Design a protein around this nucleic acid. Sequence first.
RNA 1: CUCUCUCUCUC
RNA 2: UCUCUCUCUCUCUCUCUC
RNA 3: UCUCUCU
Lengths: 454, 428, 26
Amino acid sequence: TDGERQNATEIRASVGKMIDGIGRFYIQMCTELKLSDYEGRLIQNSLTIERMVLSAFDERRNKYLEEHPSAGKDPKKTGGPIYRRVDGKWRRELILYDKEEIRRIWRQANNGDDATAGLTHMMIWHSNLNDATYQRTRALVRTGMDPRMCSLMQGSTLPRRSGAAGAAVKGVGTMVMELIRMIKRGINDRNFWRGENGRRTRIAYERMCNILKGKFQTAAQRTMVDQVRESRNPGNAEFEDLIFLARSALILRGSVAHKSCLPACVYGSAVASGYDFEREGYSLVGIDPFRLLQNSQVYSLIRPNENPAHKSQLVWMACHSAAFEDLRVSSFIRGTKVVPRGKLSTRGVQIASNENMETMESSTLELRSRYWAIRTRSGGNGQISIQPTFSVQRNLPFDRPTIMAAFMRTEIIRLMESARPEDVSFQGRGVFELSDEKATSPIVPSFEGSYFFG
Amino acid sequence: TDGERQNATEIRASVGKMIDGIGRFYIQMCTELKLSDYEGRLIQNSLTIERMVLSAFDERRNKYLEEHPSAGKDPKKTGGPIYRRVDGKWRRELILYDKEEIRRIWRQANNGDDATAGLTHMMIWHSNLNDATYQRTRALVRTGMDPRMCSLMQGSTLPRRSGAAGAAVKGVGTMVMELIRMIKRGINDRNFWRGENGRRTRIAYERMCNILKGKFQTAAQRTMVDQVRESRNPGNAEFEDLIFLARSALILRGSVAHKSCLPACVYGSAVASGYDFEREGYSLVGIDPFRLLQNSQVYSLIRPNENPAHKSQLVWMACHSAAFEDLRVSSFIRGTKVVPRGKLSTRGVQIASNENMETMESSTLELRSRYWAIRTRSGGNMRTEIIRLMESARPEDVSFQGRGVFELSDEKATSPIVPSFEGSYFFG
Amino acid sequence: GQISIQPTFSVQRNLPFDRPTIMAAF
RNA sequence: CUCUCUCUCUC
RNA sequence: UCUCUCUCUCUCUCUCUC
RNA sequence: UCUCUCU
Ligand SMILES: *[C][C]([O])[C]O[C][C][C][N]C(=O)C1=[C]C(C2=C3[C]=[C]C(=O)[C]C3=OC3=C2[C]=[C]C(=O)[C]3)=C(C([O])=O)[C]=[C]1
Ligand SMILES: *[C][C]([O])[C]O[C][C][C][N]C(=O)C1=[C]C(C2=C3[C]=[C]C(=O)[C]C3=OC3=C2[C]=[C]C(=O)[C]3)=C(C([O])=O)[C]=[C]1
């Protein structure tokens, strides 16, 4: 430390510059689509604007669309549902925008640079919302994985375009699903793993195996992944071995990064208020997102016979990526009880085309938490040598068995049997108050369900 | 010898002039902060004064603060918690000072010269205190190194500003961690190692690899570190061998210099007593630090329900950089048993803002040792050969044969006192 | 359903899991 | 290596 | 002008088998 | 320019 303060300050400015671009871009798009303050703060409108940007920068898909155009949709225009309130009633009109026009607007907002970090940030926000709202058991079964490992499905909807940043936030289960699909295509297609393309697939297979390996914590799990990577022609043996690895991650949890990626409407309102993210800096794991949401008011479309609080809790859960986190800890931080998914009387945030946009009313989202905590990239759960300082005739002791010791499957099973659902993790770490911006005094909680998707 | 007597005497005077500058500057700042005799001898006050000077001379961070000012803090002013005792009770008030005014006071105390040696000496003292107090497994786990090699993290908190002198006192684990960060940055950023800045990074990578190579002793370790240096685009492979090299250092330990950097309060007291370090000379590895500590009285702020002896032991270990040394040898030198870190009923020396500065009392630190020893820059005595060497190594080979511990009255180190020797691991 | 947990916040809670069900399929 | 180095930083 | 003993309580990353 | 909690 005392040298990593500078590095910490550097990172804060860089993330603040990304947040500024998103807000500056949203403000520009709002004034170009002619949206009022209420419609500018609608979460549905922000979703459409964000998706338009992501599609405009999808180089591969856009190229495919040009070569093989869809029916009635030219591959040069994007858009989505824009909801406007006229005479008190809500109406939806599909907006079509040139991808070149959107790309220029985004680049101009970020001082002429591509700034793919802002795009990946929005993609993470969509992934968090998808994780908190929709449960993809059909993909789990279709790949052969047990549908019970939904706690490891973090960032399963993230597109491959989100590298590094996206890969850090995605979980063990999603990573294993990517490996399995690669294995299945190799088994079905003999040409796979062979030829010029097979070389490219092999390097891709190696890279995602390494990042999956770094996600684990126990040495036994890492050694098991290392073996699977070495397989030149992976088959059922690696298929089953990876399935065991995913099952092991339920007890020996991996390191999944958790970041609070907010909707662009929040950033747009903050930037329009004169707030300078680049100057004071930002952080996706600190108090900055929590403080922003406290002062930020966001509206949403509420379908008939839907509890506005439950939708607000769903958006709150997506904002902080707490879909798979303990209900008790989430309830403590929010201050109001968090309900499991089965007891949420609401459908997804995004409104469908076939929906009668005449019985729909709008409500303010209560994205306010009583407490604030630090998001963790870690899962759950001495000196062995000496360095002489004085010129004395002693003997320099060392722990010979342990040092030389570091020179499969039964070991992993033994590790999880010792583990019990009572071990205290993150000892001494608690939840702070919104007025405590420096994380000085933690508030350790004392703790009926704890599974959101239970 | 007989020609290095002059060289040794010359070096002693140069170090004494550095200590005189440190003492002279502390005296002026105490007189200029209006601190009484008791408050001046408080270790908390000395740290605050030391930290003010180090930040006043941080050109890079000061420049960044100017360009990108912080919130509520102007980048031209520095300071820290100053603890004043009036009416029996202690209170803390933040002092704000111009970094240029601090610089002028420091420069004037060194006869108008920058005297970067004094600043680095204070930086080593802070690192020694941090090493004995706090254990940084988070950085070890974050970089991918096994947290069990906490004995090689000597001087891990030292800023990069301490070159040469700083690198000599820092350990293999810190050097490896620095390289591993470079490798991690290079792997993540493809533009790393390329362009004009890549060339500057390459020279830094080479130079820090060279000092790591000189830190090692066995020919096998030097050759492997030589191989890691030759890599034009280091990656995961160079990641692994550096980790292996770090693990080998637990058995085939490197040569890490150990210097006794005392708090500035001790130097200020000595200079006020009339001691002329320039005339009498000084040495960071000899008896001079021990003889200074014997006659020096220093106070500290004690949190409620805290043993003063344990805090005094923590300061004693940080003073002589005995954080990673054998507890038996440390206990033998001090004369009172040194307790491991887990059994210390004390927190860090520095007091936080969120701490109620009203139930805090002060105690005298017992920084006196029954014996005194000479600090060492040495350890003790491809890849398959490296593993073979540490297999032959046993935790019973006697090192420093015939070299022992002397008496405070034996200023020439004539008659050694060899110890005969239940734990031995501070962080265990 | 869900039979495990993945912490997001740094708090002193205990990470629950359905131990009998996880070890049943072994 | 029982003392024989240090004038600072990718500034 | 910060804080901390003992697994990440904050150290991003400048997007994809294009 | 699509839609979906939970084979
Ligand atoms: C394989 C091969 O083919 C690959 O190639 C690559 C290169 C080419 N490209 C070019 O030239 C261009 C591009 C573009 C784009 C972009 C850029 C960048 C980023 O980041 C993004 C993007 O996106 C997009 C594009 C195009 C189209 C679409 O659609 C999308 C450009 C612009 O933009 O302008 C130019 C050029
Ligand atoms: C690298 C680049 O980018 C830049 O460069 C620049 C160079 C010129 N200038 C300079 O350097 C200067 C500095 C100073 C200082 C100092 C000196 C010396 C020493 O040692 C220390 C120091 O510190 C400081 C400074 C400044 C500021 C601050 O803050 C600190 C000067 C003075 O001081 O005056 C001048 C110049």
